[PDB]
Amino acid sequence: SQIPASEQETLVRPKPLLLKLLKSVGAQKDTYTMKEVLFYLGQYIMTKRLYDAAQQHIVYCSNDLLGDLFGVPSFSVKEHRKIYTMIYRNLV
Ligand SMILES: CC(C)(O)c1cc(F)c2c(c1)C(=O)N(Cc1ccc(C#N)cn1)[C@@]2(OCC1(CO)CC1)c1ccc(Cl)cc1
User: Fold this and answer.
1) Is 75 helix (H, G, I), strand (E, B) or coil?
2) Do β-strands 32-33 and 11-12 pair in parallel, antiparallel, or remain unpaired?
3) Cα-to-centroid distance, 78 and ligand 1 (Å)
4) Which of 1, 37, 40, 48 holds its CA 20 to 30 A away from the CA of 9?
5) How many CB atoms lie under 10 A from the CB of residue 52?
6) Which protein residues are within 6 Å of ligand 1, measured from CB?
7) How far apart are CA 21 and CA 32, in angstroms?
8) Of ligand 1's atoms, which has the minimum distance to the CA of residue 79?
9) Among candidates 72, 54, 53, which has minimal Cα distance to 62?
10) Percent of the chain as helix, strand, coil, to the nearest 5
11) Is 59 helix (H, G, I), strand (E, B) or coil?
12) In terms of Cα–Cα distance, which of 57, 67, 61, 51 is closest to 17?
C-alpha cells in the first residue's frame, strides 16, 4: 500500500472528460470511489493497449485523451501518489 485506504475509499466526481473516459469502458454513474476510478482507468489502458512489453510498468498515453487529461506522454504504474495527483487534477 502506497495510498491510505481511507483516501482510496473516498467518493469523487469526475470532471466531464474523465467521465467520458470512464463511460467509454462501461462505467454508468457520475460519482465513484477513487479505487473505482482507478479500476476503470486500468480497463481503459488495457483496452487501448497503452502499454509495451519492453517497459512493462509504463503506461504510454501520448496522442490519447488519457495523456491530455494527465498532462504527460507516459507514466509509471508504480508511482501511486503521482497517479492520484494526476486524477485529482481531473475531479470536480
Ligand atoms: C501493463 C501495465 C502498464 O503494467 C499496467 C496497466 C494497467 F492498466 C494497470 C496496471 C499495470 C496496474 O497495476 N493497474 C492497477 C493500479 C495501478 C496503480 C494504481 C494507483 N495509484 C492503481 N491501480 C492498472 O489497472 C489494472 C486493471 C484494473 O485494476 C486490470 C485493468 C492501472 C489502473 C489505473 C492506472 Cl491510472 C494505471 C494502471
Assistant:
1) strand
2) antiparallel
3) 9
4) 48
5) 11
6) 38-39, 41-43, 45-46, 51, 56-57, 59, 77, 80, 83-84
7) 13
8) 21
9) 72
10) 45, 15, 40
11) strand
12) 67
Grid cell for residue 30 = 457520475
Output the residue whose Cα is nearest ligand 1's atom 4: 57
Q: Which of 71, 14, 69, 17 has its CA nearest to residue 37? A: 14
The three cell numbers locating residue 35: 479505487
Residue type, 59: V
Stated resolution in angstroms:
1.6
Strand, helix or coil for residue 24:
helix
Question: What is the SS3 assignment for 77?
Answer: coil
CA distance 9 to 38: 11
Length of the chain: 92
Report how this structure was experimentally obtained. X-ray
**How far is 81 from 40, CA to CA, in rounded Å?**
18
